[PDB]
Amino acid sequence: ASSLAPRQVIRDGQFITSPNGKYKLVMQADGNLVLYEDGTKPIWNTTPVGPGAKAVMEFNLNLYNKAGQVAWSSNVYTAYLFEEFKDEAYLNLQDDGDFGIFSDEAKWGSIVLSRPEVGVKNKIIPTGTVMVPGTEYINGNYRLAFQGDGNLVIYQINPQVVIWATYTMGADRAVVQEDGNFVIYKGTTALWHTHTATGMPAYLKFTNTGKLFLSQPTLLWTLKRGSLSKPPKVIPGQHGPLDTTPIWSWPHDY
Ligand SMILES: [Cl-]
Ligand SMILES: [Cl-]
C-alpha cells in the first residue's frame, strides 16, 4: 500500500511504499520516521524519539513518543481543525518521493447526514470507473449494483432490502468522471447526475452503512511543497490491492 487511512497507526517497522517501489516511509522501532530511496538511502527523517513510539494519521500525520506526546507533526496550516477531519483525512506517498495529505468534503450524497458517522469505512470507486450492467460492490452488509435493467441500487444484503436507487431504467453505463461529476447515461444521453462538475476528478465513497457519497481530492499539504492554500489539480494514481483510500499523483510545481 502507498497510503494511510484516517486513524491508521504504523509502528515498529511498519511502512508504506510508493507505487513504483522506489520510496519507503517506515516508522522504525527506534522511533524515527524515515523516508528511504531504493531500500538503502535515507533521504528524510523526523530523527528518532526512542522505543515505544508510533505514527498516526489523524488529519495531521503525528509522531507520538512512548509518553503519549506528539513529538513531530506535519502541521498542516488550517483555519479550522474539527475532530471529524481526523476521521476523513488520508495520506499518499507518490513516485517522486513526496507524500501528501488530503481531506475531502462530501460534494453530493445519497442521504444528508445529521452528524458524521463514527467508525464508518468507505469502499472507494476511483476516477474513470465505468460501471456496466452487472457491476457490483460489497462493503459490509451492503451492496451497490448497477443492474441489468440500468437501475443503480444500494441493497442491504441479509435480509435483502432496497435502501436507495436512481431509477435510471435503461441506462447502459455510469461514469465516475475526470470533470468531477458522476453521470448515468443511456449511450451518450445523460439520465441522472450528481451536479458536481468542477474540473477536479471525482471518486465515490460507498460505506458499510449503506450510503454513497461523491468527493474530489483536496490536497492540503506535502512534505516537499508545504501547506497549500488552494488545492492543485491532481490525477488518479496507481492503486494496489491493499490500498483502501483514494490514490493520486501531483506535479512538482506550478
Ligand atoms: Cl531530514
Ligand atoms: Cl481501511
* CATH fold title of the largest domain: Agglutinin, subunit A
Question: What compounds are bound to the protein?
Answer: chloride ion
Radius of gyration: 20 Å
- Under CATH at level 1, the class of the largest domain stands as Mainly Beta
Task: Note the main sheet.
Answer: 5 strands, antiparallel
| CATH architecture label of the largest domain | Orthogonal Prism
What is the strand content? 35-45%
Class derived from helix and strand content: mainly beta
| Total number of beta strands | 27
Spatial ordering of strands, largest sheet: 1-10-11-24-25
Q: Could you give the order of the helices and strands?
A: EEEEEEEEEEEEEEEEEEEEEEEEEEE
Query: Helicity, in percent?
Result: under 10%
Helix count equals 0
Quote the distance from N terminus to C terminus: 28 Å
Principal-axis shape equals elongated
What is the domain total for the residues?
2
